[PDB]
Design a protein around this ligand. Structure first.
Ligand SMILES: COc1ccc(-c2nsc(C)c2C(=O)NC(=N)NCc2cc(C)c(NC(C)=O)c(Cl)c2)cc1
Length: 387
């Protein structure tokens, strides 16, 4: 899968994107890779944050579905016009598919300034596609029309430090392998957690540790009202109760240093003298996920290098600065880009499971590394899921 290695660019804050072509002749667009949604949607009209957009009138293969679509979120929203066109992925499988495309005509806080992507590739299942589950998502179309195996995998590579506009454009962001697993992208073993339901990529968290210390919450809280793998969201998002317990413990473990309280809101940055970030004072976070063998679980361990997102100082000084990349959630546990940066994540749709391995490009120090370890004997795991 050498052709697909290095096909991603971007960063956790603005999202990771792949190059795609739509229409005839091919119109090149950069497309956000998103496991948290199910629509293939592209800018179709001028916008302050877009350098280019989809022009339907210039595509001979465009087909008008004569139907509108409105896609709200909590943080932003877009609306547009449904249609189909020919779509291909230059640095992907060597194929061309007829797929549904939402031509974005109006949007509010959906696009991101300087992100360098002009559309979204919703990789999740039809049930959450808008307007309804009848609008086939891109990947379902891809599998039906070709011989690409029903599987894709993601290696998102955080830099570990801020990248300027030129650097993010020149730098490789990672790899999306379509139809397979590239073994050079990870170390150690792949551990599989089952997909509970095919809508989002829903998983079940059975136990949570901070510096090996059990959070001792009823596991149903960890998955209230769901737990999802979501590459289109920046942060780890945790349900109110879990978030508060986690922040209380992270605060405690890192007490020897004190932070403005707006830091824990993810609003303000904390800075240290160049190279002196006290990584060691921050605790590791372990999430135990349901396993494939009955009564068996495994854990993924995340370092502060994952939950502290590098941002360049307003001072643009010599200092190394970070934002707290864990957010309070009202829509469940959301494993965002900052968590995925630590891992090679296999979306094995054909076997209804998600794999986790230590990423070959994960950021660490000399004393600690991210881990994916197992097995652990765990009981009643099924009732950790919310109904
Ligand atoms: C910060 O507050 C938040 C509150 C809730 C969640 C959330 N909780 S659960 C779940 C499934 C999601 C989710 O929306 N996942 C997803 N892939 N969404 C699509 C997508 C991608 C982009 C890049 C934008 N644009 C900007 C500026 O963020 C927009 Cl609008 C939507 C995420 C962030």
């Amino acid at each position: 899968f050498v052709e697909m290695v290095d096909n991603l660019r971007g960063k956790s804050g603005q999202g990771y994107y792949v190059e795609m072509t739509v229409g005839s002749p091919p119109q090149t667009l950069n497309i956000l890779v998103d496991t948290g949604s199910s629509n293939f949607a592209v800018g179709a009209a001028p916008h302050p944050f877009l350098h280019r957009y989809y022009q339907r009138q210039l595509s001979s293969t465009y087909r008008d579905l004569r139907k509108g679509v409105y896609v709200p979120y909590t943080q932003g929203k877009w609306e547009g016009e449904l249609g189909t066109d020919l779509v291909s992925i230059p640095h992907g499988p060597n194929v061309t598919v007829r797929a549904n495309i939402a031509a974005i005509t109006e949007s509010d806080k959906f696009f991101i300034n300087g992100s360098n992507w002009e559309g979204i590739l919703g990789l999740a299942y039809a049930e959450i596609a808008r307007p309804d589950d009848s609008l086939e998502p891109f990947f379902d179309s891809l599998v039906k029309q070709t011989h690409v195996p029903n599987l894709f995998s993601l290696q998102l590579c955080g830099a570990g430090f801020p990248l300027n506009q030129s650097e993010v454009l020149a730098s490789v962001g990672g790899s999306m392998i379509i139809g397979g697993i590239d073994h050079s992208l990870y170390t150690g073993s792949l551990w599989y957690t089952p997909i509970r339901r095919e809508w989002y990529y829903e998983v079940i968290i059975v136990r949570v540790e901070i510096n090996g210390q059990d959070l001792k919450m009823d596991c149903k809280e960890y998955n209230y009202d769901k737990s999802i793998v979501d590459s289109g969201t920046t942060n780890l998002r945790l349900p109110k109760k879990v978030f508060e317990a986690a922040v209380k413990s992270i605060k405690a473990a890192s007490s020897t240093e004190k932070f403005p309280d707006g830091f824990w809101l993810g609003e303000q940055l904390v800075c240290w003298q160049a190279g002196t970030t006290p990584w060691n004072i921050f605790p590791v976070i372990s999430l135990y996920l349901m396993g494939e063998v009955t009564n068996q679980s495994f854990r993924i361990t995340i370092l502060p290098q994952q939950y502290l997102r590098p941002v360049e100082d307003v001072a643009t000084s010599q200092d190394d600065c970070y934002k707290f990349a864990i957010s309070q959630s009202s829509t469940g546990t959301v494993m965002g880009a900052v968590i995925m940066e630590g891992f090679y994540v296999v979306f094995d749709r054909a076997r209804k499971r998600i794999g986790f391995a230590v990423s070959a490009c994960h950021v660490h120090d000399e004393f600690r590394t991210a881990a994916v370890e197992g097995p652990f004997v765990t009981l009643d795991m099924e009732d950790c899921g919310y109904n």
